[PDB]
Short mmCIF file of C-alpha atoms and ligand atoms in Angstrom, two decimals:
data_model
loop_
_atom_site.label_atom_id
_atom_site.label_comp_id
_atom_site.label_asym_id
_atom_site.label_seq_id
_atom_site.Cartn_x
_atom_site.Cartn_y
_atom_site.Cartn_z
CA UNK A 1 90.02 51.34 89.26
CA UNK A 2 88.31 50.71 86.08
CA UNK A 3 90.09 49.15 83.14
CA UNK A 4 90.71 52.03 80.59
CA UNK A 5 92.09 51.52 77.05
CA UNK A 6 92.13 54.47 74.33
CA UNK A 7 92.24 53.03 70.50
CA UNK A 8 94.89 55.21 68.57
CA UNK A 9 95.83 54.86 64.89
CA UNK A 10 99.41 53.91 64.59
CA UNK A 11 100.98 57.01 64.12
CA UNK A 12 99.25 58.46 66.64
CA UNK A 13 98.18 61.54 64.05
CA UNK A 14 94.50 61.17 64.57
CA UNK A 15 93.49 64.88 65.83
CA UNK A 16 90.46 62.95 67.37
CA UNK A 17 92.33 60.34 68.99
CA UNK A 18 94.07 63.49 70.64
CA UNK A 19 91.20 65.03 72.06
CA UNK A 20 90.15 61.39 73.65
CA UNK A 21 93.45 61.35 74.95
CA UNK A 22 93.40 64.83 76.01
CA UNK A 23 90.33 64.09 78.13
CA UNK A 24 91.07 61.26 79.92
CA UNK A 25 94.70 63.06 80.60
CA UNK A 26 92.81 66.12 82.17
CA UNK A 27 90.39 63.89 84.41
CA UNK A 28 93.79 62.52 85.82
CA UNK A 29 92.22 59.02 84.66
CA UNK A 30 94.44 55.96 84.47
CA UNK A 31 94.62 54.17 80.97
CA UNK A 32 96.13 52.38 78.49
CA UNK A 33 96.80 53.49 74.87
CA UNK A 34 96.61 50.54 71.97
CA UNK A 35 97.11 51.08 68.22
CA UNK A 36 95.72 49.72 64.83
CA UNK A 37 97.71 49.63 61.89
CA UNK A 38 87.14 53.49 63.75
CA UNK A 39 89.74 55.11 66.23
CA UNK A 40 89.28 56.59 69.08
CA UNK A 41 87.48 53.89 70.19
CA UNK A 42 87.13 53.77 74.46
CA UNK A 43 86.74 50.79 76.76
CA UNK A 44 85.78 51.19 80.14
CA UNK A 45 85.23 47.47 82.07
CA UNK A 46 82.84 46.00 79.31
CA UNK A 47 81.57 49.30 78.12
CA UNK A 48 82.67 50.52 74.29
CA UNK A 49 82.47 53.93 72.52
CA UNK A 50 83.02 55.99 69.78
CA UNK A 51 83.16 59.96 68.24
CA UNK A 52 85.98 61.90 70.25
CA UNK A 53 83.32 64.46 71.50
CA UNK A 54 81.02 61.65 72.98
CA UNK A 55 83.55 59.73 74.74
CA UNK A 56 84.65 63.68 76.18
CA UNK A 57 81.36 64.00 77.48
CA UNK A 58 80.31 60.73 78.69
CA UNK A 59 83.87 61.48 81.23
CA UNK A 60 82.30 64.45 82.12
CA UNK A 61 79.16 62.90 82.86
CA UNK A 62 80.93 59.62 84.93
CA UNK A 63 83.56 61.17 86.56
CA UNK A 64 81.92 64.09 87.29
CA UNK A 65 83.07 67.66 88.57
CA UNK A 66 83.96 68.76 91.20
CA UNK A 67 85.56 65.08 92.27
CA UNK A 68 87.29 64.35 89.19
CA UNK A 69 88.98 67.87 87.19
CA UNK A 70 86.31 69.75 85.07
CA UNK A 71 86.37 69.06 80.98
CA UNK A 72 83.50 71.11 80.23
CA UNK A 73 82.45 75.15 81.48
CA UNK A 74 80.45 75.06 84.26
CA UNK A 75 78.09 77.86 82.96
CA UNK A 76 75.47 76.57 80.46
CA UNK A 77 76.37 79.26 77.88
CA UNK A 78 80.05 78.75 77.72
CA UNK A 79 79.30 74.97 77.55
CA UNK A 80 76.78 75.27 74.44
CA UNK A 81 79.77 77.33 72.89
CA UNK A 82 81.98 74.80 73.63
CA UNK A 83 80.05 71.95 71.83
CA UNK A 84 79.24 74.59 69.06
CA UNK A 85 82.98 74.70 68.54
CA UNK A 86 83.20 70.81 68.70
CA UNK A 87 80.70 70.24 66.74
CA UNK A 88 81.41 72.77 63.99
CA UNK A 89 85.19 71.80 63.80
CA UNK A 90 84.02 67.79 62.98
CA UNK A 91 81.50 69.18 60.68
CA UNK A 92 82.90 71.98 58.41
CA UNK A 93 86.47 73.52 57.47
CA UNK A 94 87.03 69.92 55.08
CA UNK A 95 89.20 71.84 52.79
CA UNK A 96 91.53 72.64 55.90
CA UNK A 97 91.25 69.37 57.11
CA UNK A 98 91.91 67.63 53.67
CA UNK A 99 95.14 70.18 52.68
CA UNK A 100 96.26 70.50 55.88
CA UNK A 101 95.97 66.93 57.07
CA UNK A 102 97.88 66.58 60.69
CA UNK A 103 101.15 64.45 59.31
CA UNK A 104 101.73 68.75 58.96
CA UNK A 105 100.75 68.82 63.01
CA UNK A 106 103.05 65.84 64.34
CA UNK A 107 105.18 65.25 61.57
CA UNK A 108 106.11 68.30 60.46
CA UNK A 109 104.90 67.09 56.73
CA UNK A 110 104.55 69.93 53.76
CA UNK A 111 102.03 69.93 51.41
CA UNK A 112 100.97 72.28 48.30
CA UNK A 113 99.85 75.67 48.65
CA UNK A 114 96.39 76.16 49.36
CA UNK A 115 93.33 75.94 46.87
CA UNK A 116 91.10 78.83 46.18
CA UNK A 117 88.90 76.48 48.31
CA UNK A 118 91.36 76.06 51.45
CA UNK A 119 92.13 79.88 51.49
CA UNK A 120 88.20 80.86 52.03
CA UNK A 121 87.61 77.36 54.58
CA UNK A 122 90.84 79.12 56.45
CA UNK A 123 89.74 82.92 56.00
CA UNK A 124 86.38 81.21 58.09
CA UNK A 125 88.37 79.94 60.45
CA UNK A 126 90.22 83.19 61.12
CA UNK A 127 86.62 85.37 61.23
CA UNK A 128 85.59 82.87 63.40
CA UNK A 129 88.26 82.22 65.67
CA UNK A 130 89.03 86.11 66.00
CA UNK A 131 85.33 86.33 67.06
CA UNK A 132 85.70 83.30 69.31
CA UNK A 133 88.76 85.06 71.20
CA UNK A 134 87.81 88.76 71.05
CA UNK A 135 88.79 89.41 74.09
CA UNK A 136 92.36 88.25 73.38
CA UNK A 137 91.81 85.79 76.66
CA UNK A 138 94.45 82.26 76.36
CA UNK A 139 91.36 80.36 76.79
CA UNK A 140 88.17 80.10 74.73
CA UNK A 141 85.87 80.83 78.45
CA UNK A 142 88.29 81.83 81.14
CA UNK A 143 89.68 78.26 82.17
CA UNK A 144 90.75 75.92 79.44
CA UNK A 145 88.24 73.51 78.54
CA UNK A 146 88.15 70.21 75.78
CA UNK A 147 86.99 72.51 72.89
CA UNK A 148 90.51 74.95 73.17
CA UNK A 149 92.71 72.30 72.83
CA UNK A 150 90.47 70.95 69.30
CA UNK A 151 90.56 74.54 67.95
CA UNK A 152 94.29 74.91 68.29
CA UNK A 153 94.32 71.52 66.56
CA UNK A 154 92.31 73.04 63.63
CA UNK A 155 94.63 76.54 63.73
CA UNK A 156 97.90 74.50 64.01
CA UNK A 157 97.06 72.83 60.43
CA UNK A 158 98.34 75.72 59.45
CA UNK A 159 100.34 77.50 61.87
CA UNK A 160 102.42 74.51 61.90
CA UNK A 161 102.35 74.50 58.12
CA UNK A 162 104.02 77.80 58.02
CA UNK A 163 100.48 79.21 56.46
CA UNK A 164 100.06 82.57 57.51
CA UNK A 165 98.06 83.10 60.54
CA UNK A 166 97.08 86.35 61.78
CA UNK A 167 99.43 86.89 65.01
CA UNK A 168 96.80 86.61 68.00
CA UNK A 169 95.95 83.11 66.85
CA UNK A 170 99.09 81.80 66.35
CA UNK A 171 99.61 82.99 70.05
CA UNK A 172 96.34 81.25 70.88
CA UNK A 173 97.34 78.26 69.00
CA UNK A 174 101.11 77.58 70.17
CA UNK A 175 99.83 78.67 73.91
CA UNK A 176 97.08 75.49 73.64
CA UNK A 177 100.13 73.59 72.55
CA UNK A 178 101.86 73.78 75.21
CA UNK A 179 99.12 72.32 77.41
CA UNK A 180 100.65 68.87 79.29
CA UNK A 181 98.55 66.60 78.34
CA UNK A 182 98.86 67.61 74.41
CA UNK A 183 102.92 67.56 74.86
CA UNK A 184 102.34 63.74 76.49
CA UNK A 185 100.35 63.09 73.07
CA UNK A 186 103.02 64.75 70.85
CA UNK A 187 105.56 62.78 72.64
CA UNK A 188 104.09 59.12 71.06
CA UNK A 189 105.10 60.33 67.84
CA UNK A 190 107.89 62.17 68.31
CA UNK A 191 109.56 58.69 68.82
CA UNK B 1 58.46 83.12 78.91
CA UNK B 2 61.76 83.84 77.11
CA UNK B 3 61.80 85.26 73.73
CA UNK B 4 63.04 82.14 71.35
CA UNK B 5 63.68 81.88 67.46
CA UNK B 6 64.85 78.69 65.13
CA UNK B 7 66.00 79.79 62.10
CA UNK B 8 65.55 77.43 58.86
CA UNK B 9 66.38 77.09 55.68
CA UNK B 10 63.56 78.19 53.42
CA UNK B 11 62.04 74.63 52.25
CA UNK B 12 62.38 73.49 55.76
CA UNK B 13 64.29 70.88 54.05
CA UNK B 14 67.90 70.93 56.61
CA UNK B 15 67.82 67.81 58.91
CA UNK B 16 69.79 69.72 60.86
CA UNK B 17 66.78 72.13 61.52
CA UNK B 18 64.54 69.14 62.00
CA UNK B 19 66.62 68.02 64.64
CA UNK B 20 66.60 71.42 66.72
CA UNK B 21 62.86 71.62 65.95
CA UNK B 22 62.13 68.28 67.42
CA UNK B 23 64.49 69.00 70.49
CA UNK B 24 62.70 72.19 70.92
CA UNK B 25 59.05 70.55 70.27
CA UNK B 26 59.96 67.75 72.92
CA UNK B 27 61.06 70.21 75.47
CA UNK B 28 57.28 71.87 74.66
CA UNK B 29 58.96 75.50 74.27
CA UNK B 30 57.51 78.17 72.52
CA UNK B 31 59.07 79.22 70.09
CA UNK B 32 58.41 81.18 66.24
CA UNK B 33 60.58 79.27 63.48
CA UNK B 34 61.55 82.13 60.78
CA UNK B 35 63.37 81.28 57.49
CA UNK B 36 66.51 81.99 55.67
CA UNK B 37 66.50 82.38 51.70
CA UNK B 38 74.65 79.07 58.68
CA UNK B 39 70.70 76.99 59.99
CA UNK B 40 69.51 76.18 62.15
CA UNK B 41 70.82 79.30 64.36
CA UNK B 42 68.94 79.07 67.64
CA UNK B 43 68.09 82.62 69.54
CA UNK B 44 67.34 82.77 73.04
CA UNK B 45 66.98 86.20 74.42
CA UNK B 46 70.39 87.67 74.21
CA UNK B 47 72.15 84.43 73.47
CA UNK B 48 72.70 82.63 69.91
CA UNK B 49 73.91 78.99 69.67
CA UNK B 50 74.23 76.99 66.39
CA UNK B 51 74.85 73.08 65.51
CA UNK B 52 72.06 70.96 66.25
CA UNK B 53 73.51 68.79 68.34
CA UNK B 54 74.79 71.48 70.75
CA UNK B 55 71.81 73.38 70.49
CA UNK B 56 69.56 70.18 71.64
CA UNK B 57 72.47 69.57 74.57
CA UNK B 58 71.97 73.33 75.62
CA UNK B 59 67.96 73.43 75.88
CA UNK B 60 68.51 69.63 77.95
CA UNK B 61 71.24 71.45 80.45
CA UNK B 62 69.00 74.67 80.63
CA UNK B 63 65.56 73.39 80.59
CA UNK B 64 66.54 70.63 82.79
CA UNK B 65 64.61 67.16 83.79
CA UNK B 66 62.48 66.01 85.73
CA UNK B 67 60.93 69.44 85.21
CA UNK B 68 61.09 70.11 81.39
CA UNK B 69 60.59 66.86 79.83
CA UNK B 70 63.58 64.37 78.84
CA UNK B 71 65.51 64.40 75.17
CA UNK B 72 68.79 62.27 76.41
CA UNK B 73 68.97 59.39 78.36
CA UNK B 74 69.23 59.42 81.85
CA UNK B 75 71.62 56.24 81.77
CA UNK B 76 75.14 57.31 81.71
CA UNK B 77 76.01 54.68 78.75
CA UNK B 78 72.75 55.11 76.57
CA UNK B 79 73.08 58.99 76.90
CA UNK B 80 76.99 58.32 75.54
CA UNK B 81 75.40 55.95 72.92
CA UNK B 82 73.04 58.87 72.40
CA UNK B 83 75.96 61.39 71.32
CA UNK B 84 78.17 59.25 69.94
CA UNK B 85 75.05 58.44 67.12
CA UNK B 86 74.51 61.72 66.32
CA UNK B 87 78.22 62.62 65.85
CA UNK B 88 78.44 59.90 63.60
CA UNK B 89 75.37 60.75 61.67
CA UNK B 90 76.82 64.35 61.36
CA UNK B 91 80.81 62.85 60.61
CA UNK B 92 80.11 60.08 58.24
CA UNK B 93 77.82 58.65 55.89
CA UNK B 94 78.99 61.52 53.45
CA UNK B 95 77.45 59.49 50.47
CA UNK B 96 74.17 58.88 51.51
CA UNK B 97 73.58 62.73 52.55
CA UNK B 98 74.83 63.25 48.71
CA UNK B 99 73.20 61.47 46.85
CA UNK B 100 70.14 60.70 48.88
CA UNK B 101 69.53 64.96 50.16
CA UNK B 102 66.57 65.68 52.22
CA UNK B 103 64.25 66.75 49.48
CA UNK B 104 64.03 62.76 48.83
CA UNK B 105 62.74 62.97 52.44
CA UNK B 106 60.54 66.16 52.69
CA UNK B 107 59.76 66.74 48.77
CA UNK B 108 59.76 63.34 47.25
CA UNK B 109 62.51 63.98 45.33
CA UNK B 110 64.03 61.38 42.85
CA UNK B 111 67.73 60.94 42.13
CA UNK B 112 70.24 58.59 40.16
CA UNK B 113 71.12 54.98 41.49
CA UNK B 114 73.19 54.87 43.97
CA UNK B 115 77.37 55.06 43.15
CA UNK B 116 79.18 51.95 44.40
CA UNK B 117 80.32 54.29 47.52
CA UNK B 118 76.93 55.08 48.19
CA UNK B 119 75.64 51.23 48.20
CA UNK B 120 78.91 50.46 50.59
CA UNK B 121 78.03 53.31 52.27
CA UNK B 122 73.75 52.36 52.69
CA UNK B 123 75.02 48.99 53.89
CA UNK B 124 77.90 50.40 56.83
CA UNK B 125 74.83 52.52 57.88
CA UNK B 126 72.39 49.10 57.77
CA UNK B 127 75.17 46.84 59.87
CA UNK B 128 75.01 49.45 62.42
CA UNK B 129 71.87 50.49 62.85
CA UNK B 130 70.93 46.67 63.30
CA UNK B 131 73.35 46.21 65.67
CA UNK B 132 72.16 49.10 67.29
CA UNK B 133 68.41 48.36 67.50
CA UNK B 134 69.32 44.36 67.45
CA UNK B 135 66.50 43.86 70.62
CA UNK B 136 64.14 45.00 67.74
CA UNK B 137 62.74 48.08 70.43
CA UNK B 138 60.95 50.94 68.70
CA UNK B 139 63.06 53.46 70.33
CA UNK B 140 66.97 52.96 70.88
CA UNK B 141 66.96 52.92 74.46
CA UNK B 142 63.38 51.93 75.44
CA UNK B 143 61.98 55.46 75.92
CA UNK B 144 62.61 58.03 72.88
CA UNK B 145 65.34 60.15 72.86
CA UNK B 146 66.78 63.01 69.81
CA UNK B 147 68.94 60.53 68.52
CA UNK B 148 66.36 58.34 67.47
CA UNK B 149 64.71 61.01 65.26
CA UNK B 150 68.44 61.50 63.40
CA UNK B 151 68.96 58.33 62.81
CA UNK B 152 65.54 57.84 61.36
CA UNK B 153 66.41 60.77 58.99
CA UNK B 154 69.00 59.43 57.83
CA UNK B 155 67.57 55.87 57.09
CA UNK B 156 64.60 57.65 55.55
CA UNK B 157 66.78 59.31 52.93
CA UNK B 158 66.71 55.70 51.80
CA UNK B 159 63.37 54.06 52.66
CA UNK B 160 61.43 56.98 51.37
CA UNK B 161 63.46 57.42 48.02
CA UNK B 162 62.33 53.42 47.27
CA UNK B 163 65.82 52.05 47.90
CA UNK B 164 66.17 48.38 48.78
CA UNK B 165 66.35 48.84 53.23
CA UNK B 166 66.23 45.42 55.60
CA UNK B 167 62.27 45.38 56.73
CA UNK B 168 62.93 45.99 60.34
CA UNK B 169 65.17 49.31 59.80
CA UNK B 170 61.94 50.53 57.34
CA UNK B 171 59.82 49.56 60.25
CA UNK B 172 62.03 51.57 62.69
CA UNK B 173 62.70 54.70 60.78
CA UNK B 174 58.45 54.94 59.81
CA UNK B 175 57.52 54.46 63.41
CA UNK B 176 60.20 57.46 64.01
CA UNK B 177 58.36 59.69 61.19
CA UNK B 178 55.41 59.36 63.09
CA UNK B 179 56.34 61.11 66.14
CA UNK B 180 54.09 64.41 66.18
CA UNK B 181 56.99 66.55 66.53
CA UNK B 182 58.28 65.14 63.38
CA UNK B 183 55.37 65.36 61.62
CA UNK B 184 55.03 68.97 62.55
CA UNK B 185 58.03 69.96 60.94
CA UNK B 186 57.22 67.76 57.41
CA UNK B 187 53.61 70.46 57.77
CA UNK B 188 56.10 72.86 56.90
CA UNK B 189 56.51 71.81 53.77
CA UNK B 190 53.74 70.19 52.71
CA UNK B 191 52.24 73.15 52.12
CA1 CA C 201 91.27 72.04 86.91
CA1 CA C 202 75.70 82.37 81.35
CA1 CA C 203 58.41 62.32 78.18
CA1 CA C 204 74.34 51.93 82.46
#
């Protein structure tokens, strides 16, 4: 057994501490969680890193399928769409991520009504997402995989805002929410 | 041979173009680069895949080593290291990729002094970087790999606007622009 601990900000609100957490939950690995009053930060034994969607993959890459439970699709097209939709989500949609900050996701915090700004960044979101899930399947590729649970992050901004959502995403959205290891994360906060 | 296309902005200015370019270059695929007046957008046969990042990940899962050459690390920790640079390249350093844009790197562009964010910001990206390549090796991990090109960018929106740079980052990041795949891409634009 390695020594695992997961960095968390103190509310545990970070959506990228979640998908850290949300990882190491899903490859069943054994850890502690810390807070700061940087984050997620991972140690591993005397190893340290950083950025939510690198410390994802390097679990992949360690504890590798089919021994330790599959983050990533298996087929090389679903997992380049998967780190598309990682990638894109940490690197676009800021008006959604700045109105919709996620005190709205675990706190159930309400904030103004959406700039001219936020309603086109969310209007992408919904092209995109609709695209994403056109064939109205729970899961982005079949089985769930790191980059479902971070897109019903980015779709519960506003779900969970009361924002309207068209319908198939808000099924999308709440159905990712009820995955385990997101309901152990919600549970920090809850009390 | 499969049919490929990289799609670029029109000054083949993006960084984020660069990068696919190089990852494409390294891999020694043919390819035809075509140009937008949304990039780079990579097209491979039937299949489209966009962010840089994910796009470099998909053509080093699909045109795998030993038998296409190598644009990760083949250490577990270095290839994390690897990711977790370019996510914070692409997450961070918001400043510097405002007020220092690529045509300071690719057009010799000149712009205002930097803000007080963007000095605090030019000197969280030097205390890293140092620490980072504190050995003093050409390449982050020994051998190259894509995230030494994008951290080069971004240290060249610096060096090569005339800002003030420690001498062995300026060393670093102009040993990086003279990688041939690199210095392909600036051809673009140079004429
Ligand atoms: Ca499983
Ligand atoms: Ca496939
Ligand atoms: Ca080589
Ligand atoms: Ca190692």
């Amino acid at each position: 057994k390695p020594a695992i601990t997961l960095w968390s900000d103190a509310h545990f609100f970070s959506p990228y501490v979640l998908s850290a957490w949300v990882a190491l939950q899903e490859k069943g690995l054994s850890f502690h969680i810390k807070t700061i009053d940087r984050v997620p930060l991972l140690q591993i034994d005397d190893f340290e890193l950083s950025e939510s969607s690198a410390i994802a993959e390097y679990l992949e890459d360690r504890f590798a399928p089919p021994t330790w439970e599959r983050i990533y699709p298996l087929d090389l097209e679903n997992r380049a769409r998967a780190r598309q939709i990682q990638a894109w989500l940490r690197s676009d949609l800021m008006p959604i991520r700045e109105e919709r900050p996620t005190d709205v996701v675990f706190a159930g915090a309400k904030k103004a009504p959406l700039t001219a700004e936020g309603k086109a960044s969310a209007e992408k979101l919904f092209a995109m997402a609709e695209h994403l899930l056109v064939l109205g399947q729970p899961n982005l590729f079949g089985e769930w995989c790191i980059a479902d649970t971070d897109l019903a992050l980015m779709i519960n901004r506003l779900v969970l805002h009361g924002d309207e959502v068209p319908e198939r995403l808000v099924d999308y959205a709440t159905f990712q929410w009820q995955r385990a290891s997101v309901q152990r994360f919600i549970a920090l906060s809850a009390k």
